[PDB]
Each structure stands twice: as structure tokens, then as C-alpha cells.
């Protein structure tokens, strides 16, 4: 069996989804070499767990689970199997025994306009943490106390979703980053 696996549109799309609304896609019965991921100069380290990036061609597996999102700077280090924080316990959590790694690179020249860009949103208020490999897209308000907020903005009533601020004049630690997650299972 020899066919061209669609590994191009997974991270070459014009517009990506939000952090809380990452898209899950499934591809099977396909082969693809991993040498195409060295084209970008600002490409970050693979820092892969379990399976080395060197021996990623001869190994054969079952399925590919790929999801992508756009996050700010100083945020790719929080994507770990065992980790805690804001974006890890609320939007995307990874299993401790999960085998695979992420792919990240700088995207300041694409996901940034001359005005304020707020098309990417992330959630930072939740009542409880989420299980790994769960997407929670919802606009239901939360209560910060005893006040029964029935969808009214005010004291102790805040929306979980907040919009990122991306500008070309911002620093390295606030630049947007295009991150696509790869998962390998046998």
C-alpha cells in the first residue's frame, strides 16, 4: 500500500481554531515521511517523549490524532504529560502515559494584523478541572460566589472566555505561536 497521506492541510491552513475549540481529525491507511518538518527557520525543538524523532520513520502505528491551536509566548513549555497551571488544567490536558509530542513554531508574520487581533480566545475560569483529551466549548456563565448570575455581567459574574492580544510590536514572550499536537498509539 502506497498513498499520499494528507499531512499538508493539518498545519498549512489559512486560519486556525481557538485554544478551547481545537479540531480533532483522524487519518488512517497512509504513510508519510517526517523530513518535511525542517523547512521553517523559527522551528522549535521537538522535545519528544517516549519515541525519538530520529526513529520516527521505520516505526509503524495504527492511527494519527492531530489537533492544532494558536497560543501566546512562554506557553509551549506548559504542554506536558505531568504539569499544572492555567492553560493546562482548563483548556488542554495531556495524559501522563501518553506517547507522542507537539510541534510548535513562531507565527508572528501570519496570525497578527496591524490592528488588535482577537480572533483567538482561551478559557481561564472554570469550576473544576477537566480530564485529559477533552474539549469543552460552552458559553455558560459561572458564579464566583453566592450570586446567581443568570447571564448578567457584573460583580462575581465573569465570562470564562477571554481574547488574546496579538500585535507585531509585542515581544518574543507575547508573540503568537502555532502549535499542532501529534499522538502515537500502538
Amino acid at each position, epitope marked *: 500500500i502506497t498513498n499520499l497521506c494528507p499531512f499538508d492541510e493539518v498545519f498549512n491552513a489559512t486560519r486556525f481554531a481557538s485554544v478551547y*475549540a481545537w479540531n480533532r481529525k483522524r487519518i488512517s491507511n497512509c504513510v508519510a515521511d517526517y523530513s518535511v518538518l525542517y523547512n521553517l527557520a523559527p522551528f522549535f525543538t521537538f522535545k519528544c517523549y517516549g519515541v525519538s524523532p530520529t526513529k520516527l520513520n521505520d516505526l509503524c502505528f495504527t492511527n494519527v490524532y492531530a489537533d492544532s491551536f494558536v497560543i501566546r509566548g512562554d506557553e509551549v513549555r506548559q504542554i506536558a504529560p505531568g504539569q499544572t497551571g492555567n492553560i493546562a488544567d482548563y483548556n488542554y490536558k495531556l495524559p501522563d502515559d501518553f506517547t507522542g509530542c507537539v510541534i510548535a513554531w513562531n507565527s508572528n508574520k501570519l496570525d497578527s494584523k496591524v490592528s*488588535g487581533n*482577537y*480572533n483567538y*480566545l482561551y478559557r481561564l475560569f472554570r469550576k473544576s478541572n477537566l480530564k485529559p483529551f477533552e474539549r469543552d466549548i460552552s*458559553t455558560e456563565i459561572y458564579q464566583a460566589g453566592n450570586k446567581p448570575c*443568570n447571564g448578567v*455581567a457584573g460583580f462575581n459574574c465573569y465570562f470564562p472566555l477571554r*481574547s488574546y492580544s496579538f500585535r507585531p510590536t509585542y515581544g518574543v514572550g507575547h508573540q503568537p505561536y502555532r502549535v499542532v499536537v501529534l499522538s502515537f498509539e500502538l
Partner: antibody
Amino acid sequence: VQLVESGGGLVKPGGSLRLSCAASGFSFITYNMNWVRQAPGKGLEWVSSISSNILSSTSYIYYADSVKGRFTISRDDAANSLFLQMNSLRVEDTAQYYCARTRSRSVRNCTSATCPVDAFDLWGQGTMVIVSS
Amino acid sequence: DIVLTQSPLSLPVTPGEPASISCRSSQSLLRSNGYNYLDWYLQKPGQSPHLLIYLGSNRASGVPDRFSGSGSGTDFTLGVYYCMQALQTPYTFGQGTNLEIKR
């Protein structure tokens, strides 16, 4: 944070009018908002409404009783653009149109025929829409 | 569906004492949990109107801590001023408030 819009001009009765609104300084795709028109003689009046894309899976569109089904408006997530199309105009339809914006930021207990909101936090600059044969 | 009427057509105002305006409705706006749905707007001459008092007794940002929101049920009591009805599709406004100074 402010809303800027343009596209006003001299429109004959009938035909189409190009009216667009733009948003900057705040998130556009997570906001439910509507349109507000103000006649030069009397006060403000309600014209239409449109629900957000990510607020609810099923989009909710509302119109006033006098223009129910006459006006066809929509919003665009890309480039922070809000549109308003026209099909037929009357000599009593002249007003000043404001780009209304609500601070509710959520939708609940809303059917396809009614949806309550709390208030309109900010209003953009108006446009001069005048009709003349 | 309904019409909102304002009792004071034109009254003089002075900086020494606060004014008083009212909007009269014809339907109950209490709904659930006592949440009254009626706003108040202030419009500058030749400027875009903004929000000062919202949801009845609640207050919004930008207030000068003078226009206190008071009202319960179908009775409410606080350029031109307008009030909102947030129960049905038509949003009725104020007719002719026009607060002017005493001369």
C-alpha cells in the same frame, strides 16, 4: 473598543444600500449585538438583531414588526466585519443608524421568536442614510 | 407590542438639587429572581449615546455616582433620556425627555 462604520449615501427607494460596520480593540466573534436606527425627528427605535456564531449553535435572527422579513442582515467572523443589506426603501425609512453592541456576552432562555438582553454598553458613530427621489 | 410613556415632558434643572424622571410601562418586568429589565440612556447633543444605568437598580461603568437607579415592578424613577423594555421583540424608547437648565 470603539465602533467605526461607513457606507451612508443618497439612496433611491428600492435597490440596495451598502452598509458595513467594523470592530477594533475588542473581540467581535463572541459578542451578540444588533442595530439601532434613530430618525432625525423622533427618538431611537429598534430595527433588527442577530445572534453570535460561537454563543449558540443555532443562529437567532430577529427583526422589528414593521420590517419583519424586509431586511436581510448578517455578520462575518473574518476581518471583524458586520454587514447590512437592503432590498427596498421608503421615503419614511430615513434615519441615523448606530452600530449597537451589547454587554450580555451570552445567550440563554432565547427561542426563535424572542431573546432578552440586559443593556447596550457602547454605541458606535452614526451614519447619514438619507432617501430622496 | 407595548408603548413606554414618560410623565415629565420638560422640567427645569439646577446643579443644587438632583432631578427626577420616570418611565411608565404597561407590563410586568419582574420575570424571575426580581430582575427588572429596564435601562436608562444619556445622549449628548451630536454624540453617540452610551449606557449609565442598566437592569433597573443596578449601575454600570462611567457613572458619576449621582444618577442612582431606583424602581421596582412597573414603576421606575431616576440632553435627552430614554428607557428600555427587554421582554418582547420591540424595544420601545423615550419620546421627549429633553432635560434643560433652569433659566
